[PDB]
Write a protein that binds this DNA or RNA. Structure first.
Ligand code: ZN
Lengths: 31, 159, 49, 66, 58, 48, 347, 126
RNA sequence: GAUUAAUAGGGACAGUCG
RNA sequence: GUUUUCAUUAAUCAGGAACGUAAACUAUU
C-alpha cells in the first residue's frame, strides 16, 4: 500500500475527502 | 480647467500656441486644447523628462495625432523626453497608466515573478515590431512609472 | 585486420552526403518479364536511338 | 437576440416537420432546441428583460410569423 | 568482422589510415626502449594537489 | 533504537515512493550499527 | 569491462534530507563540506569516512551555496542570507562568526583563488563581491537593466578576477573585477543550470544546460560553441571540469553521472545506482582520480574515475601491461567487436 | 467538473513532481493558488514561480516535495484541534505543513501557532 | 450608474463536410 | 475561421419524456 496517504479520510488523485463523522471524531478525540 | 500657470506650465502653453500657428497645416485637437497639466521630475541623474496630463477624450485625439508632435516638442523644447498621459485620481488605473505611458507600441505580457522569498518583481514585455527608438526611452518609462504610481516595474523586449 | 570495408564505407558516405550495354540490359530484363519503369525509360531511349 | 434566432430555428424545423411528419431526427432536434429555448428564456425571465407572462408553445410562433 | 566498418574520425583517406597503423605495439616486435616510448601515455598524473596554473608557461 | 546499514540499504533500494520513510529512518538521534558482510540481506544480518 | 567496479564508498551516514550543495577545499586535499536540504551543513575529512568532523544546523531553508575560504573557514548561502563559520578550532563553535542578509535572496557562492575575496550571486539580478577583513556590505555589480535571478557564479581560477555567471533568462554573462563592471551577455536556447571555468586553459568554460546538454564555450568568441556534449536524458544539474583539465563530470537530474573526455562529445562512462534517487552536485577531488556525488537521497557517494584503473603504487610490469592495454585500445578501438564491448553498458 | 481550481493546480503539481519535470504550466490562475505557492516557496518546496497573462503560472521546482492536496470540506479548526489535526494529517510533525486560510490571511501551522490564530484547514503539503 | 472577457457556455456570418 | 455578439446563462442526474430468433472462446500519460 502507499505509505504517504494520510490516515483520516480518502484520497482521490489530489483531492482529499473527509466525512463529517470523521471530523466530529477528531473533535471528540480533542475533547 | 484647474491650473494657474507655473514656470513650465506657461512654457508648454506657449509651445502649443506656436504649434498652432507659424507651422503646419496640422492642428486637430490643438485648438480645442488649453492649459491642461504638466510635471517635471528628474529621470536618472542630470536628465529630466516632462510629462503632461490631458483630459480623457483628448488622449485618443492625441493618439490620432502623436507622431512628430512629440518629436517637434523634443527638438524645440529643452532636448528631453516629452510624454503624455491621462489625468486620474485601482489596478485598472495602473493598467491605464502603463498603456498610456507606452503610446505607439502595444504591451504584450506582464510577468510577475516572485523571487525565492516573498519579494516579487514585475516585468512588462512589449511588442517586437517597434524596438529601435524606444530602448533609450525604456529607463525613462520605468522611472516615470515609479514616480507616479510607486510599484517598480521593468520594461523589456521579448526574445 | 584493420583495413577498410570499402563497400560499407561507400554506403556510409552515401548515407551521409545525400550504346551497346543497354541492348543486353533490355535482353536481360525481357526475361522477367516485369515492365519496370526503368526498363520503360530504357526502351524509350532505345526508340530514340 | 439569441432567443429570437432560436425561436426562428424552432419555427423553421416545426414547419418542415409539419410538411413531412415522417422523420424522427427532426423531432429529436426540435426537442433539443425547445429545451435550450426554455432554459435561456428562464434565464431571461430571471434577469427580467422580458415580461414574466411571456410564453411560447405555438401561438407565440404563429403570432411572431404573422 | 575483422575489417573496419569505416574510417576513424580524424583520418582523411584509406591509404592514410591503413598505412598509419602499420606497426604492432607489443614487445615481441619492438625494442624495449621503443615499447616504452610508445606505450607512454599522453597525460601523466602523479598524486598530489593538482592546482590550477598560476602564471603562463610560455 | 538502532538501524543497520542493511535496513537503510533496503529502504533506499525501494523507490522514491518511500522518501518519507527514508527521511524518518535517517532521523539523526538514532544509532547506526555498520555491518561487515556482503549481500546486504537484512534478515540474515539481523539474525546473525 | 570485467573489472569496471567504480563505486568506492559513502561518506558516513549521510544527511536527513537531500544533498543540495557541496564544495571541496581547493587548498587542502581531504576537506569537503556538504550542505543538505533541511539546513544542516557537515564537514567531512576524506581520510576517515566514518563520522563527520563538524556539523551544524545552519539555516532554515535549503543550503543553496557553499564554499571553503582560503584560510580555513567556510561560507554557506541560503535564502535566509549567508554565514561564515570556522569549523576547525580547538573549541567547537556552532555559532557563525559572520552573518549577512542584506542584498536580496542569495543563491550561490564562489571564492577567489589567492586573496580573501568572494562573490555571491543574489536573486535580484546582481552578484556582489566581498573582500574579507576590510569590508562589510560588499559591492554589488549588475547588468544595467536586469531583473531575473542569477543562478550560479564562479571565479575563474587560472586567470584571477574574471567572473562567469548564469541567470535564469537562459543567458550567461561575463564580468571583470579589476574594472568592476559586467562585460558580455549571451542568450542561449535553454536555461543553463551551472557555469564552470577550466582549470588548465584560461578561456574555456562549460555550461551545464537544461537542454540536456553540456556546452564548452570559448570566452573570447561566444559566436559558436566550441563543443557540444549530448549524452543525457533529463536536465543536467551539475558539471565539473577535472583539475587536470581534460575530463568532465556531469551529474544529471535523472539517476546518472556521466564522465566525459574534453574533445569527445559523448559518454566515456556512466554511473548509476538504485540507491541514488537523483543527482545534484558532483565534483572531482584534487587527485583527479576520485569523484564525489551528492545525491538527492541524502548520500555523498565517492566513485572513482577511470573505473577500471586501481589506485596505489603499481609494480612496473603491471603498469606496463595496463599502459600497453590502453595504447592498444586507443589504436584498435573502432573494429566491431572491440567497439561493441567497449560501448556496452547496463543502463 | 471540479470547480476547485486549487485542486486542479495541485493535481498538476503532483503529476509534475511524479513525472520528474522541472517546470509546469498551471493553466487557470487564482489568488488562492498564488498564496499557496507563496507559502510553499517560504518553506522552500518550490524554486521560483511567475504569473503571466493571456493567465497562467509557471513554477520552476527543484523536486523536493512529495505530495500536495486540498481538504475538500474546508474544515474550521481551533488550536488543540489544530495540534491533533496536524498529527493526523502529516506523516510526521517535523515533515510537511498544513495550510490555513486564517483571519490573518493564508499561512502554515507553525505561523498559526506563533500568531495564536486558528482558522480553516484547507490544504497541506509534505 | 455597466470588470476580466473564461483556455465553461449559447447565438450570428462565410467557405465548407458527411 | 472571424476585425461577431448576451455574460452565468453552467455540470449532474430522483420523478418523468423522445427515440428501439438470440448468445456460443473472450489533469496528464
Ligand atoms: Zn549487515
Amino acid at each position: 500500500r502507499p505509505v504517504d496517504l494520510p490516515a483520516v479520510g480518502r484520497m482521490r488523485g489530489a483531492e482529499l475527502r473527509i466525512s463529517a463523522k470523521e471530523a466530529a471524531a477528531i473533535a471528540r478525540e480533542v475533547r | 480647467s484647474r491650473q494657474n500657470p507655473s514656470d513650465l506650465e506657461r512654457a508648454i502653453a506657449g509651445a502649443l500656441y506656436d504649434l498652432e500657428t507659424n507651422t503646419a497645416d496640422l492642428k486637430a485637437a490643438l485648438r480645442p486644447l488649453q492649459f491642461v497639466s504638466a510635471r517635471e521630475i528628474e529621470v536618472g541623474h542630470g536628465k529630466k523628462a516632462i510629462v503632461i496630463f490631458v483630459p480623457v477624450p483628448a488622449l485618443q485625439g492625441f493618439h490620432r495625432v502623436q507622431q512628430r508632435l512629440t518629436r517637434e516638442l523634443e527638438k524645440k523644447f529643452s532636448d528631453r523626453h516629452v510624454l503624455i498621459l491621462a489625468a486620474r485620481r485601482l489596478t485598472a488605473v495602473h493598467d491605464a497608466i502603463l498603456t498610456d505611458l507606452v503610446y505607439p507600441v502595444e504591451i504584450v505580457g506582464k510577468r510577475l515573478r516572485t523571487k525565492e522569498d516573498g519579494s516579487k518583481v514585475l516585468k512588462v514585455i512589449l511588442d517586437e515590431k517597434e524596438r529601435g527608438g524606444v530602448d533609450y526611452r525604456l529607463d525613462t518609462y520605468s522611472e516615470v512609472y515609479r514616480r507616479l504610481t510607486g510599484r517598480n516595474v521593468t520594461f523589456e523586449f521579448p526574445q | 585486420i584493420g583495413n577498410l570495408d570499402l563497400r560499407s564505407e561507400k554506403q556510409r558516405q552515401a548515407e551521409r552526403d545525400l550504346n551497346t550495354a543497354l541492348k543486353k540490359y533490355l535482353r536481360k530484363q525481357r526475361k522477367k518479364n516485369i515492365i519496370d519503369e526503368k526498363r520503360l525509360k530504357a526502351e524509350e531511349l532505345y526508340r530514340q536511338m | 437576440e439569441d432567443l429570437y434566432f432560436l425561436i426562428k430555428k424552432a419555427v423553421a424545423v416545426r414547419k418542415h416537420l409539419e410538411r413531412n411528419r415522417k422523420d424522427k431526427d427532426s423531432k429529436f432536434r426540435l426537442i433539443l432546441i425547445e429545451s435550450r429555448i426554455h432554459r435561456l428564456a428562464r434565464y431571461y425571465k430571471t434577469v427580467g428583460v422580458l415580461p414574466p407572462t411571456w410564453k411560447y408553445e405555438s401561438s407565440t410562433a404563429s403570432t411572431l410569423v404573422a | 568482422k575483422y575489417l573496419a566498418t569505416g574510417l576513424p574520425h580524424p583520418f582523411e583517406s584509406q591509404q592514410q589510415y591503413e598505412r598509419s597503423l602499420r606497426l604492432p605495439v607489443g614487445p615481441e616486435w619492438m625494442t624495449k626502449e621503443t615499447f616504452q616510448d610508445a606505450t607512454k601515455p599522453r597525460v601523466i598524473i602523479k598524486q598530489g594537489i593538482i592546482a590550477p596554473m598560476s602564471k603562463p608557461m610560455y | 533504537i538502532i538501524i543497520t546499514s542493511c535496513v537503510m540499504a533496503e529502504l533506499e533500494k525501494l523507490g522514491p515512493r518511500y522518501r518519507v520513510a527514508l527521511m524518518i529512518a535517517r532521523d539523526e538521534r538514532w544509532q547506526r550499527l555498520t555491518c561487515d558482510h556482503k549481500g546486504t540481506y537484512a534478515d540474515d544480518c539481523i539474525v546473525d | 569491462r570485467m573489472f569496471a567496479k567504480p563505486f568506492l564508498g559513502q561518506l558516513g551516514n549521510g544527511h536527513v534530507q537531500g544533498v543540495y550543495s557541496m564544495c571541496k577545499d581547493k587548498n587542502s586535499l581531504n576537506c569537503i563540506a556538504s550542505g543538505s536540504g533541511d539546513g544542516v551543513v557537515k564537514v567531512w575529512d576524506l581520510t576517515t569516512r566514518d563520522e563527520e568532523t563538524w556539523r551544524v544546523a545552519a539555516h532554515n531553508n535549503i543550503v543553496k551555496g557553499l564554499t571553503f575560504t582560503n584560510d580555513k573557514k567556510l561560507l554557506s548561502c541560503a535564502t535566509d542570507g549567508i554565514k561564515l563559520w570556522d569549523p576547525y578550532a580547538s573549541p567547537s563553535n556552532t555559532t557563525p562568526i559572520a552573518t549577512w542578509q542584506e542584498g536580496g535572496p542569495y543563491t550561490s557562492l564562489s571564492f577567489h583563488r589567492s586573496a580573501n575575496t568572494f562573490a555571491a550571486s543574489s536573486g535580484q539580478g546582481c552578484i556582489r563581491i566581498w573582500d574579507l577583513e576590510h569590508s562589510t556590505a560588499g559591492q554589488a555589480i549588475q547588468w544595467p537593466s536586469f531583473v531575473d535571478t542569477i543562478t550560479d557564479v564562479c571565479f575563474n581560477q587560472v586567470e584571477t578576477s574574471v567572473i562567469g555567471s548564469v541567470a535564469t533568462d537562459r543567458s550567461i554573462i561575463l564580468f571583470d573585477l579589476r574594472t568592476n563592471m559586467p562585460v558580455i551577455k549571451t542568450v542561449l536556447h535553454f536555461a543553463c543550470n551551472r557555469i564552470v571555468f577550466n582549470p588548465m586553459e584560461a578561456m574555456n568554460l562549460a555550461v551545464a544546460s537544461e537542454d540536456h546538454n553540456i556546452y564548452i564555450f570559448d570566452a573570447r568568441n561566444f559566436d559558436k560553441a566550441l563543443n557540444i556534449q549530448k549524452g543525457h536524458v533529463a536536465a543536467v544539474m551539475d558539471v565539473e571540469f577535472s583539475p587536470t583539465g581534460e575530463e568532465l563530470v556531469s551529474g544529471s537530474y535523472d539517476r546518472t553521472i556521466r564522465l566525459w573526455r574534453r574533445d569527445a562529445g559523448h559518454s566515456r562512462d556512466v554511473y548509476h545506482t538504485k540507491r541514488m534517487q537523483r543527482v545534484f552536485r558532483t565534483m572531482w577531488t584534487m587527485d583527479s582520480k576520485y569523484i564525489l556525488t551528492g545525491s538527492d537521497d541524502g548520500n555523498v557517494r565517492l566513485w572513482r574515475a577511470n573505473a577500471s584503473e586501481r589506485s596505489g603504487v603499481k609494480a612496473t610490469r603491471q603498469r606496463q601491461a595496463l599502459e600497453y592495454n590502453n595504447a592498444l585500445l586507443d589504436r584498435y578501438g573502432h573494429l566491431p567487436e572491440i567497439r561493441r564491448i567497449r560501448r556496452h553498458r547496463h543502463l | 467538473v471540479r470547480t476547485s481550481v486549487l485542486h486542479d493546480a495541485l493535481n498538476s503539481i503532483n503529476n509534475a513532481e511524479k513525472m520528474g519535470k522541472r517546470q509546469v504550466m498551471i493553466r487557470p490562475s487564482s489568488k488562492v493558488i498564488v498564496k499557496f505557492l507563496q507559502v510553499m516557496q517560504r518553506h522552500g518546496y518550490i524554486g521560483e514561480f511567475e504569473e503571466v497573462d493571456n493567465g497562467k503560472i509557471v513554477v520552476q521546482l527543484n523536486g523536493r516535495l512529495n505530495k500536495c492536496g486540498v481538504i475538500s470540506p474546508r474544515y474550521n479548526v481551533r488550536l488543540a484541534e489544530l495540534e491533533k489535526w496536524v498529527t493526523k494529517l502529516l506523516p510526521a510533525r517535523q515533515f510537511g505543513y498544513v495550510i490555513l486560510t486564517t483571519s490573518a490571511g493564508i499561512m502554515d501551522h507553525e505561523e498559526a501557532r506563533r500568531k495564536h490564530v486558528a482558522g480553516k484547514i484547507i490544504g497541506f503539503f509534505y
